[PDB]
Enzyme design. Structure first.
Site, PDB file in Angstrom:
ATOM      1  N   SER A  83       0.833  -1.234   0.000  1.00  0.00           N
ATOM      2  CA  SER A  83       0.000   0.000   0.000  1.00  0.00           C
ATOM      3  C   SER A  83       0.860   1.274   0.000  1.00  0.00           C
ATOM      4  O   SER A  83       0.309   2.344  -0.286  1.00  0.00           O
ATOM      5  CB  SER A  83      -0.991  -0.025   1.141  1.00  0.00           C
ATOM      6  OG  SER A  83      -1.950   1.016   1.019  1.00  0.00           O
ATOM      7  N   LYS A 127       2.477   6.423   5.955  1.00  0.00           N
ATOM      8  CA  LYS A 127       1.727   5.427   5.170  1.00  0.00           C
ATOM      9  C   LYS A 127       2.224   4.035   5.532  1.00  0.00           C
ATOM     10  O   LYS A 127       3.447   3.831   5.600  1.00  0.00           O
ATOM     11  CB  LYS A 127       1.927   5.657   3.671  1.00  0.00           C
ATOM     12  CG  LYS A 127       1.077   4.764   2.777  1.00  0.00           C
ATOM     13  CD  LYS A 127      -0.394   5.125   2.780  1.00  0.00           C
ATOM     14  CE  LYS A 127      -1.284   4.053   2.184  1.00  0.00           C
ATOM     15  NZ  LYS A 127      -1.412   2.881   3.080  1.00  0.00           N
ATOM     16  N   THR A 128       1.283   3.120   5.743  1.00  0.00           N
ATOM     17  CA  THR A 128       1.617   1.711   6.035  1.00  0.00           C
ATOM     18  C   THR A 128       1.502   0.863   4.765  1.00  0.00           C
ATOM     19  O   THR A 128       0.882   1.307   3.764  1.00  0.00           O
ATOM     20  CB  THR A 128       0.677   1.132   7.097  1.00  0.00           C
ATOM     21  OG1 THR A 128      -0.649   1.283   6.595  1.00  0.00           O
ATOM     22  CG2 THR A 128       0.810   1.809   8.443  1.00  0.00           C
ATOM     23  N   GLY A 129       2.046  -0.343   4.837  1.00  0.00           N
ATOM     24  CA  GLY A 129       1.894  -1.337   3.765  1.00  0.00           C
ATOM     25  C   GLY A 129       2.128  -2.723   4.325  1.00  0.00           C
ATOM     26  O   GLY A 129       2.833  -2.850   5.337  1.00  0.00           O
TER      27      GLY A 129
END
EC number: 3.5.2.6
Lengths: 246, 246
Positions: B48, B186-188
């Site tokens: 993501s 932002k995470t992923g």
């Protein structure tokens, strides 16, 4: 269209406060207020004036860019929270009057006057604003005009570049959650006298899921202990309308 | 040269038996530290975190019509219930809504997507994977160092895109807002994978504390979703040890 909701007066009477709240969903064409007369009455903007002051500073190039650092020269300031280097966002968020007075000095009266007219900002008066004045005639703005101005900023429709409006928008973020975002700004003109009270403000907008709500609150204030009501009264009315934060 | 290996930073990784890397830089990508130089330059599936360039490209190409576009849910089942609703651009990024970004990528097309990943120097610039699920050995991968370089360019509005579009995506990435403390992040998570071939979890972003800026990129191997909270707790502990506290 603006509807008077007299049920909203209960939050003011519970705190023994004289004030107004204007709340609009989606646009300034769908609004509600506790007091139609006060919603259109003009008051000193106090630190809420830093919003147009910042846009004008960027438009005129007085504020060089998004990342400019306003250095503290070490000379005494009226509040300890201002005695430090500040970003544009920091200066807005801590209401650093001296940073904005220097920006307004560099912009000058001719350009400041021109932009307040372009922005339809209150009575567009040349006096007061970021300066302390006891002039009878000086800059004043109503809660309805604040909502109209903030909606224009949200839509990037002010007479300014979209880039400069976006820079000021991020500087106004005060709460960020995945589906709940608040842009807001406080103001406080000073306790005045018991007969001639000061004004306190909270203005901004809330993006909840895919909805947007614009708001403007002001209240008469003669005791500084009452200042937190400028956020608690509007927060309670917005929670009653289902607009709830973290 | 510009990066120092701090072996002491392995403390929070060993305590959790985690294989991962943290890259932290102050002011720019020319002053950085990491717990593992080799892993800092190793390329991993962006998951993501790829929504950041995907959003900029969507705005640049007009696929994302403007900052205020609402991505309507067609009522057809999605992989997560949190995605079964209308979303703003910020909402879609904040909840990692894969289907919204796959539709944006479909409208941009492979040719244009490729052109922009080259303009942004984004990882191995591979045309495959990204927002789409693939098990190909040759698909889009990016290192923690490259994430920091890309985020620094975004912070400075230096990517090959309009400053308006970079500013729109930056406000969509705000995850914490205090008067003198602002976080963009932002995470992923690529998926649990296998014990022999593990998935990767990310946390990337930057912190503006007072007048300082810190860029960061964290990734870790993950074979059990119970370990996901560590993608935020490990980097948070290292940043708190450097006085970066929110």
């Amino acid at each position: 269209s603006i509807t008077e909701n007299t049920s909203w007066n209960k939050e003011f009477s519970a705190e023994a406060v004289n004030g107004v709240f204007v709340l609009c969903k989606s646009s300034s064409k769908s609004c509600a207020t506790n007091d139609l007369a006060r919603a259109s009455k003009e008051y000193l903007p106090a630190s809420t004036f830093k919003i147009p002051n910042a846009i004008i500073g960027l438009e005129t190039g007085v504020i060089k860019n998004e990342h400019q650092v306003f250095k503290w020269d070490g000379k005494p300031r009226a509040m300890k929270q201002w005695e430090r280097d500040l970003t544009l966002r920091g200066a807005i968020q801590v209401s650093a009057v001296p940073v904005f007075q220097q920006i307004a000095r560099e912009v000058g009266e001719v350009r400041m006057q021109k932009y307040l007219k372009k922005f339809s900002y209150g009575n567009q008066n040349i006096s007061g604003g970021i300066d302390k004045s006891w002039l009878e005639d000086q800059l004043r703005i109503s809660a309805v005009n604040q909502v109209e101005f903030l909606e224009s900023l949200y839509l990037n429709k002010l007479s300014a570049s979209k880039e400069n409006q976006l820079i000021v928008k991020e500087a106004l973020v005060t709460e960020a959650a995945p589906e709940y975002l608040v842009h807001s700004k406080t103001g406080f003109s000073g306790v005045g006298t018991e007969s001639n009270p000061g004004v306190a403000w909270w203005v901004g907008w809330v993006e909840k899921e895919t909805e947007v709500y614009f708001f403007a609150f002001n209240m008469d204030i003669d005791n500084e202990s009452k200042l937190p009501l400028r956020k608690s009264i509007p927060t309670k009315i917005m929670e009653s309308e289902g607009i709830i934060g973290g």
